[PDB]
Design a protein around this ligand. Structure first.
Ligand SMILES: [Mg+2]
Ligand SMILES: [Mg+2]
Ligand SMILES: [Mg+2]
Ligand SMILES: [Mg+2]
Ligand SMILES: [Mg+2]
Ligand SMILES: [Mg+2]
Ligand SMILES: [Mg+2]
Ligand SMILES: [Mg+2]
Ligand SMILES: [Mg+2]
Ligand SMILES: [Mg+2]
Ligand SMILES: [Mg+2]
Ligand SMILES: [Mg+2]
Ligand SMILES: [Mg+2]
Ligand SMILES: [Mg+2]
Ligand SMILES: [Mg+2]
Lengths: 171, 125, 138, 88, 56
RNA sequence: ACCAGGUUGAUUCUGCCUGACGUAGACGCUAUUCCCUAAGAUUAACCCAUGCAUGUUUUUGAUAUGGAAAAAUGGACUGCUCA
RNA sequence: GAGAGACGGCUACUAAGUCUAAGGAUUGCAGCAGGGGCGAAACUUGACCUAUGGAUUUUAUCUGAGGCAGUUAUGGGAAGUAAUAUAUUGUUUCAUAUUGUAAAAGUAUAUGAGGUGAUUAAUUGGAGGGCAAAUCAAGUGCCAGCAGCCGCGGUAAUACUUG
């Protein structure tokens, strides 16, 4: 269809496997997701950089080790899935793409604002966070967010608080 | 519960249109967005021109932040404000339908003369 | 015909061998415009004429209930199969029906012989819902 | 098409005009002049986008009819006048 | 010599018993929540799915 | 970067049918929000009731304080369809 | 006429017509709404120059080009139908200010009341193999019927009908 109306993700290849539904149901109940569909969105972009990580190891260009690969390592580091590395040194750039292949789906699924509340002391359960966010009681440093699947970047991690003027506080 | 503060960002002067421009910042802490009646009163103290010479527009609230943005235009006297602004922007501070104007124009291009001739042929019958 | 400068002899030879594909042969002759039974569409309309039954093939034994209709778009006569139990009691003669296909690429499936169409609507009432009992027939 | 064209489209506008490819559909087709088709820009975009002196179509006529605009030492009051390369 | 008189013999012959009203079934992530805690108590993940779920 | 069921008392092959998955149109049953995006192309480039889409301008000034005509300028662009 | 073999310009023939006082006169919706036919198949005979443009200087003239709203499961997003242990707290279905609009909606910010998740708030398809899920119960007995392919139905059917 048109660009505004194409679809992003399809059905899996084998609809009924007992060896696939058991593995995935351990992820839904642990992280607290409502649809099987919304799990499929976060794994495809996990596949797409791994499609790009393989090419940069095999590039024979002298500048591709300098530009696009360094433009690969930053984007994960701003969201904070990767921890941090020195971009001036050449040999650690090789280590950065080699560390990329050792990730999982849970490295992406853990930096979500629903789970990141419960891992802090604000929420008791993960289901306590989904019921709390939608009423509008939780705020980042200036903004009041109502989307539990909002990705939390690296620098904005420590500044999660309650809303100061909500009924969840005293006022 | 009504709260309003004023912060002036990017003050610029316009000599040809004889006006000044600035971008306002409103802090409404535990209140809705303010009506424009009270904000026009507040600029009369800081800018000593009359409150009728001042016009403000486009008050948009950033969502879930308790802070809104708007714009300010001021003039010296009253008559150039009616000259340089648009019509509906003036008439907010203080015609004929479309389907009838199309009917009289089409009857006007039919005639080969005045209404004196249009009655004069009816005199003969 | 394996050579570096033999592209003219390779393309001319491989077009001849491609004509023995049984799916590609019908695309060249355009048989779906020439010998189509229903036209080119998902459904059709018709007028009922008979209410008759047929007998299925060996080794099974039953009586399958069908109906002989006449289409509007082309004007031909054709037979369709009533697809549910106790559904023929709704049907009266001099009435309209809507016809849907079986889904086996123009062939007959099951043990019903020579028939490739089934009824879906009667008097703009869904027969799948009318068997469930949600609606009533006027 | 038995004659010339008079309407221009925003998608085929030059990118060096720094226009937004947003809500608009048409763009101003400038007059014929001394410069070529590439090194020219309309005047009404200069007073609106690059220089910031007007907001809408009404304030364009105010500065132009007040006869202060002086291109190459000449007064000009047409909004479709092409400003070329190198002129002051 | 083909009979069509026996159309619809079985379905009108079997007697009808009425439906029994049920509680409102939960929908959403709570529907997935009631299914996950019910599977974890019987060790359904550990034995790799080798049991009978519908037991009656 | 993945294959399964079907010829025999049982086995190994060639060979085809079928299941699992996409892209455009139509249809059955059921629906609380908000923002974005689309809608007589496929058969008939078949016939049309009614209403509306091209006029501006002191250049002169109608026995007429602001409009009659004449002059001047554009109606060849824009929009619709795919024989 | 600078530019038309122009059709919301003219002339003739062919196929279809309409008005009349009977001598004559006249029409081209593959422009926007709308009706008829055809089909399995597709929407308001709605408001307006706000923003982008055209008409030889376009700040007040015109603009069914072009915007702004109504009808429709055409698709893609951000979300709901509960949470902590009967009870507590409190999301939508209700209203109202300001912002806003060419004038009206709508979105956003704030404010009001009432008290309910058996509720105003979940459906569609399937249960022999492929292929995740019952040899559970009651009826019928090669009948009525089901099944893309293999195949079940002969008084104990996990393979038809109901629960
Ligand atoms: Mg199929
Ligand atoms: Mg057509
Ligand atoms: Mg004239
Ligand atoms: Mg065509
Ligand atoms: Mg053609
Ligand atoms: Mg033309
Ligand atoms: Mg032409
Ligand atoms: Mg012609
Ligand atoms: Mg026409
Ligand atoms: Mg039309
Ligand atoms: Mg449709
Ligand atoms: Mg059911
Ligand atoms: Mg199984
Ligand atoms: Mg089937
Ligand atoms: Mg089955």
């Amino acid at each position: 269809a048109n660009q505004f109306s194409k679809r992003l993700v399809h059905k899996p290849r084998n609809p009924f496997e007992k060896d696939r539904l058991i593995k995935e149901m351990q992820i839904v109940g642990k992280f607290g997701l409502k649809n099987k569909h919304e799990l499929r969105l976060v794994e495809k972009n996990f596949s797409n950089d791994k499609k790009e990580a393989r090419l940069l190891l095999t590039s024979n260009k002298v500048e591709d080790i300098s530009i696009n690969s360094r433009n690969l390592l930053d984007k994960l580091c701003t969201a904070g899935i990767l921890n941090g590395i020195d971009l001036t040194s050449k040999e650690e750039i090789l280590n950065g793409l080699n560390s990329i292949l050792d990730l999982t789906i849970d490295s992406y699924l853990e930096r979500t604002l629903q789970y990141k509340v419960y891992s802090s002391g604000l929420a008791k359960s993960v289901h306590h966070s989904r019921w709390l966010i939608t009423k509008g009681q939780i705020s980042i440093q200036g903004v009041v967010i109502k989307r539990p699947n909002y990705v939390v970047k690296a620098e904005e991690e420590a500044f999660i608080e309650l809303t100061p003027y909500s009924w969840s506080n005293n006022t | 519960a009504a709260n309003c503060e004023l912060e002036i960002l990017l003050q610029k002067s316009n000599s040809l249109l004889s006006r000044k421009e600035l971008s306002l910042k409103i802090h409404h802490e535990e209140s809705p967005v303010p009506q424009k009646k009270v904000i026009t009163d507040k600029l009369s103290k800081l800018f000593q021109t009359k409150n009728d010479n001042i016009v403000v527009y486009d008050i948009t609230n950033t969502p879930g932040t308790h802070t809104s943005i708007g714009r300010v235009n001021i003039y010296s006297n009253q008559d150039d404000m009616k000259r340089v602004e648009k019509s509906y922007m003036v008439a907010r501070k203080t015609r004929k339908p479309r389907r009838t104007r199309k009917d009289e124009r089409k009857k006007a291009y039919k005639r080969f003369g005045t209404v004196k001739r249009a009655m004069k042929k009816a005199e003969r019958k | 015909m394996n050579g570096l400068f033999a592209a003219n002899d390779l393309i001319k030879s491989r077009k001849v061998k491609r004509r023995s594909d049984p799916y590609y042969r019908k695309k060249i002759l355009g048989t779906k415009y020439k010998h189509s039974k229903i036209g080119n569409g998902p459904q059709a309309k018709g007028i009922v004429l008979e209410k008759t039954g047929v007998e299925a093939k060996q080794p099974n034994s039953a009586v399958r209930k069908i109906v002989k209709i006449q289409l509007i778009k082309t004007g031909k006569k054709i037979s369709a199969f009533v697809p549910h139990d106790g559904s023929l009691n709704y049907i009266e003669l001099n009435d309209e029906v809507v016809v849907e296909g079986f889904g086996k690429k123009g062939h007959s499936c099951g043990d019903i012989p020579g028939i490739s169409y089934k009824v879906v609507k009667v008097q703009n009432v869904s027969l799948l819902a009318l068997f469930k009992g949600k609606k009533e027939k006027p | 098409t038995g004659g010339p064209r008079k309407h221009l489209n925003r998608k085929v506008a030059p990118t060096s005009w720094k226009l937004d490819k947003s809500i608009g559909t048409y763009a101003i087709r400038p007059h014929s002049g001394p410069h070529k088709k590439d090194l020219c820009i309309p005047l009404a975009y200069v007073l609106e986008k690059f220089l910031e002196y007007a907001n809408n179509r009404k304030e364009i006529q105010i500065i132009l009819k007040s006869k202060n605009i002086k291109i190459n030492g000449k007064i000009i009051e047409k909004r479709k006048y092409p400003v070329g390369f190198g002129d002051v | 010599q083909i009979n069509i008189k026996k159309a619809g013999k079985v379905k009108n012959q079997t007697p009808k018993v009425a439906k029994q009203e049920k509680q409102r079934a939960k929908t959403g992530r709570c529907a997935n929540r009631r299914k996950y805690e019910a599977r974890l108590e019987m060790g359904y993940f550990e034995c790799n799915g080798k049991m009978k779920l519908n037991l009656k």
